[PDB]
């Protein structure tokens, strides 16, 4: 869940 939170915050797939 802490991981889910940081993914929601930060996860990006660059073009």
């Amino acid at each position: 869940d802490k991981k889910q939170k940081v993914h929601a915050l930060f996860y990006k797939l660059d073009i």
Partner: antibody
Framework: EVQLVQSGAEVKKPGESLKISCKGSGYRFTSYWIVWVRQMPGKGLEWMGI????????KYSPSFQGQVTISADKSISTAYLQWSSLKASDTAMYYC???????????????????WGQGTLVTVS | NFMLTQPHSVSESPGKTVTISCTRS????????VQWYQQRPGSAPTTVVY?????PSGVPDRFSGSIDSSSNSASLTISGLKTEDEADYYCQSYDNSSWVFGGGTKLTVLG
């Protein structure tokens, strides 16, 4: 070699505008978030905001929203922090930092500030 | 919304171990990841712990982070103290997308 290099010290007067910069080199600039952090003299760190240069996704601390603008220019690998009307209370050291890590949407992914700019002192008097 | 409270200062002689606490004022500390930063006087900060207890590459294993749910705190342990460890240390977590920093702790390595 990954490097974040900020612009030089600024001496301004209240009411003036200002744009300071954080240039990234040694890596794909558009692939990593840039954080800005403020530090008033003799005081602690304050988070200002964050920008993802790839799609310009930007978040601000509630205490800096509407006070400052964070931006980015892909072509020159540079993040910016800017004010429309400086106040004496903007006197501080400003740091940028790259959010590095493993950008995978699974449990191996992680994010942390792995490189820091050297800081830019802004003195407004 | 919450704050992170740290002792104003800690100290020990070289070779000893020091612990710096970071207490979350409201909400459980285990609800959001805690990072730690070292800032030597006059220099940019560097990250010494992320995600509660992960050590970045390049950081000596003398630095170790942990969480203590029973005291709603995070802690940074600095073991085998060296003179170069003298610095301010900041904890940091997240409040609904916003980053929250503790007030900082001055570590003095007694000379």
């Amino acid at each position: 070699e990954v490097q974040l290099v900020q612009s030089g010290a600024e001496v301004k007067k209240p009411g003036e505008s200002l744009k300071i910069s954080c240039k990234g080199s040694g890596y794909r600039f558009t692939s990593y978030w840039i954080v800005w952090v403020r530090q008033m003299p003799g005081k602690g760190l304050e988070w200002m905001g964050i920008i993802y240069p790839g799609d310009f996704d930007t978040k601000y601390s509630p205490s800096f929203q509407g006070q400052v603008t964070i931006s980015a220019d892909k072509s020159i690998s540079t993040a910016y922090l800017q004010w429309s009307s400086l106040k004496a209370s903007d006197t501080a050291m400003y740091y940028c930092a790259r959010l590095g890590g493993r950008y995978y949407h699974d449990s191996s992914g992680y994010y942390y500030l792995d490189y820091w700019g050297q800081g830019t002192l802004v003195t407004v008097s | 919304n919450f704050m992170l409270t740290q002792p104003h200062s800690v100290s020990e002689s070289p070779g000893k171990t020091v612990t710096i606490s970071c207490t979350r004022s409201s909400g459980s500390v285990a609800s959001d990841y805690v990072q730690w930063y070292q800032q030597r006087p006059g220099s940019a900060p560097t990250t010494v712990v992320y995600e509660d207890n992960q050590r970045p590459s390049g950081v000596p294993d003398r630095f170790s982070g942990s969480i203590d749910s029973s005291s709603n705190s995070a802690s940074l342990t600095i073991s085998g103290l060296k003179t170069e460890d003298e610095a301010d240390y900041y904890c940091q977590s997240y409040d609904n997308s916003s980053w929250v920093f503790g007030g900082g702790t001055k570590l003095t390595v007694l000379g």
